Design a protein around this ligand. Structure first.
Ligand SMILES: NC(=O)c1ccc[n+]([C@@H]2O[C@H](COP(=O)([O-])OP(=O)(O)OC[C@H]3O[C@@H](n4cnc5c(N)ncnc54)[C@H](OP(=O)(O)O)[C@@H]3O)[C@@H](O)[C@H]2O)c1
Ligand SMILES: NC(=O)c1ccc[n+]([C@@H]2O[C@H](COP(=O)([O-])OP(=O)(O)OC[C@H]3O[C@@H](n4cnc5c(N)ncnc54)[C@H](OP(=O)(O)O)[C@@H]3O)[C@@H](O)[C@H]2O)c1
Ligand SMILES: C[C@@H]1CN(C(=O)c2ccc[nH]2)Cc2c(C(=O)Nc3cccc([C@@H](C)O)c3)nn(Cc3ccc(F)cc3)c21
Ligand SMILES: C[C@@H]1CN(C(=O)c2ccc[nH]2)Cc2c(C(=O)Nc3cccc([C@@H](C)O)c3)nn(Cc3ccc(F)cc3)c21
Lengths: 412, 412
């Protein structure tokens, strides 16, 4: 019989990723796993039709059932409003879900021995976590049109003495100014997620800051992480022969690049961005990275591919043209989700399945069966021949055949 | 007779780079060029002995003579303080020089046809530099001890308006808050350095901004660069068949990835995250990148290798073990410095020399004579045989022999 997988929240998306998402379910998941599936259609037409209520209901379902797996979705701009005749320029469903759940966004690459990367020596992923403070977390920047003083004041709730700090007195010309903040509770949540991620993986954790420039602001992150480590995690880390260390951002980047990988990196940046850094995009654009939101309760996770809907491929698909879209990141959104479900329910069979599907995916690519973009990584796009890659459907078929063999081997 | 090279500020450094720096001068520079050499010993023992006065004097000399060439130096940490029994944990000489001169740092790769790169199609360097305020910049950050409102106000000098922006109302606990600013003059300086770098190279310039969180900050950089281009550089650029364009980071990364290179990339800074400028320095670990500080004046230049003192190789050298340290980046700090000196003085003979030394260096590697790290790039470190590379001294000897032949050919 099939594995009884339990309660999973699944969010359907848009364009090419919507096609691949259905292929993953029909070919890799449903033949082996039975789910109490809480399925939400976050397709742009359905979000428009429901006045974005579907997104809010999907976020509430993840909060209730603790496991969410999300397909890439269209974030509307002026062009999308005209394309689909939208009622409004709906907000990013990622942003809406992230604001409702809160938590730390961790980014993890899928590594294949034959697939080039920035550093040859990187053999284990470098998991970078950025805390989501929200879109209710208002960054306060403005133009200073001309001379005058910019001041920042703190007024205690208890009526006690107001404190005023001079940011700058613009004596000639103008510029720009900004105000930023972080609550201690948000730093504490970021710390807990980071320490638990490091223990979960059995890897060391590094926190990077600019505490040389932001002595009080970044110093608070450094002190809170250190206090939490000393009081709640030091014993556990020493027992796994791992450690926690703070690093300045410049030292951390240089050290990571001379590393073999295999560490957690809690990244405290200035603007509170949670998106991948610029250079990670050269690898995320391959369909080889996931984004996992780890919520402050230590029970709720939301997993998704770290790429968009692949519009360019969807247009080819709409014209009946052959496509070669990499489903790896979307598959790993499912496996990372299912592995978390297995951990919460102590479901050994589901935990085995999720790990086996990850192994099958990496092994298929490593055996030389891959989509066009991966073949172009190895050979160079001008040198790629049709015999070097598999189309979307052929690649999914190969994964399905390989998964069947793998699960048969597991029986004996 | 030798070339009369003029006034150059030279800073001696530490460990393996100090050995190579003397070899460069004795074998590649001094047999051909006579200099009014302003030489400063920035060796860690001398900085300690002079209470870092030597560093400040070397920075003043660069300001006066416009051309500086710097050897890699030790930046002290707790371990270095113990190693050399230092009086203080002296500040980075780079930081001290940068604070005194001002300007923007640009990274420039040295490219060899047989040396693999991140993108195969990169045949000309992508000269990347980011905005950065000096150490003089004081951020207004503070602890928020408990609940209360944090607000940032702008009061124009003419007393007619007052704009108050709510940063955050801390309802539950305290945290941290900051006020930050950018003066228009600082953005203008970054723009001028970038436009002058593009004209100096005869290449187009691109400015990148994120435009996702601090849009008014990003917008000010975009407007200032465009205004400066239209009013002071557009004619000069059109005359050199080059151009200036603004691009969003994501578009810039994708474009750079499909480019052949040969452009200036000025990055708006996003401190605390993994920046393209810090990532670029990883190519410097091969000894194949320089860092050039360019002041907005267009007259003052400080050049250095984009790597450190190579301590690991220095320890081998101390034990009498064979080393293979790449001197290319240190040689290009000299040639980039000497080429700038030649431009300021209209010295055709010095300009020929600097370019000939750059050609000799690239040609030697391309003919298959290189250090171990470059041989490992091509073949993979486990497959490198002793016959695939030259040790430090053998490589310098080959460059010296090749330079002698090249300059003899130039005469006849
Ligand atoms: N997480 C999300 O929900 C999410 C994230 C980002 C963007 N978006 C949405 O995505 C839509 C389209 O964005 P976009 O096309 O600019 O970005 P994108 O879908 O990530 O695609 C950019 C390019 O990267 C390549 N690529 C990305 N993922 C790939 C994969 N799985 N397999 C193969 N190639 C892959 C393709 O390159 P080539 O064209 O060279 O083949 C593609 O055209 C937008 O409407 C945006 O709102 C959603
Ligand atoms: N601009 C500067 O003055 C500057 C910049 C950075 C660091 N530093 C100082 O440099 C010292 C050493 O720092 P570090 O060892 O972390 O950094 P590093 O000197 O850049 O060396 C790191 C590694 O990069 C490789 N490498 C760098 N340059 C090389 C070259 N020319 N040829 C061959 N291999 C090269 C070597 O890798 P392998 O180990 O695999 O052989 C080396 O061990 C420290 O005291 C630091 O403060 C100064
Ligand atoms: C560390 C994360 C995630 N990854 C991994 O963990 C990984 C993959 C395989 C083994 N490990 C990949 C990766 C890459 C990457 O490969 N960029 C890339 C860019 C252009 C062209 C190409 C082509 C060759 O594919 C690649 N960059 N970053 C951002 C980063 C960089 C420097 C830091 F210090 C910090 C963050 C990352
Ligand atoms: C573009 C700039 C400057 N470059 C050049 O111009 C260049 C070099 C050769 C010909 N041209 C090099 C470079 C590098 C680079 O090579 N980093 C690196 C890091 C670790 C380890 C290694 C090697 C040892 O494995 C390399 N990264 N960036 C940042 C970037 C990357 C991808 C983007 F899409 C956008 C920004 C850059």
């Amino acid at each position: 019989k099939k594995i009884s997988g339990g309660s999973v929240v699944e969010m359907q998306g848009d364009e090419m990723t919507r096609i691949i998402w259905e292929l993953i379910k029909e070919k890799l998941i449903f033949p082996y796993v039975e789910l109490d599936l809480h399925s939400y259609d976050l397709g742009i037409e359905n979000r428009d039709a429901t006045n974005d209520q579907v997104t809010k209901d999907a976020a509430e379902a993840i909060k209730k059932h603790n496991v969410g797996v999300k397909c890439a979705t269209i974030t509307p701009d002026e062009k999308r409003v005209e394309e689909f005749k939208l009622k409004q320029m709906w907000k990013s469903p990622n942003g809406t879900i992230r604001n409702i759940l809160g938590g730390t966004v961790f980014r993890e690459a899928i590594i294949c021995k034959n697939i080039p990367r920035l550093v040859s020596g990187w053999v284990k992923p470098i998991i970078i976590g950025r805390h989501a403070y929200g879109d209710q977390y208002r960054a306060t920047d403005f133009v200073v049109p001309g001379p005058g003083k910019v001041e920042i004041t703190y007024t205690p709730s208890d009526g006690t003495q107001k404190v005023t700090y001079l940011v700058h007195n613009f004596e000639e010309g103008g510029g720009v100014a900004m105000g930023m903040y972080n609550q201690d509770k948000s730093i504490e949540d970021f710390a807990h997620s980071s320490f638990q991620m490091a223990l979960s993986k059995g890897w060391p954790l590094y926190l990077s800051t600019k505490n040389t420039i932001l002595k009080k602001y970044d110093g608070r992150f450094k002190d809170i992480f250190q206090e939490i480590y000393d009081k709640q995690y030091k014993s556990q880390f020493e027992a796994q022969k791992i450690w926690y260390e703070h690093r300045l951002i410049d030292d951390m980047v240089a050290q990571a690049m001379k590393s073999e990988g295999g560490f957690i990196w809690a990244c405290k940046n200035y603007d509170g961005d949670v998106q991948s850094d610029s250079v990670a995009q050269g690898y995320g654009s391959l369909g080889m990275m996931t984004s996992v939101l780890v919520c402050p309760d230590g029970k709720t996770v939301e997993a998704e591919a770290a790429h968009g809907t692949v519009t360019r491929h969807y247009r080819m698909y709409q014209k009946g043209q052959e496509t070669s879209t990499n489903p790896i990141a979307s598959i790993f959104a499912w496996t990372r989700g299912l592995a978390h479900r297995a951990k919460l329910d102590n479901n050994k069979e589901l935990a085995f399945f999720a790990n086996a599907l990850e192994e099958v995916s990496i092994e298929t690519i490593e055996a030389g069966f891959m989509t066009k973009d991966l073949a172009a990584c190895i050979k160079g796009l001008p040198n790629v021949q049709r015999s070097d890659y598999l189309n979307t459907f052929e690649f999914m078929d190969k994964l399905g055949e390989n998964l069947k063999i793998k699960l048969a081997q597991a029986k004996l």
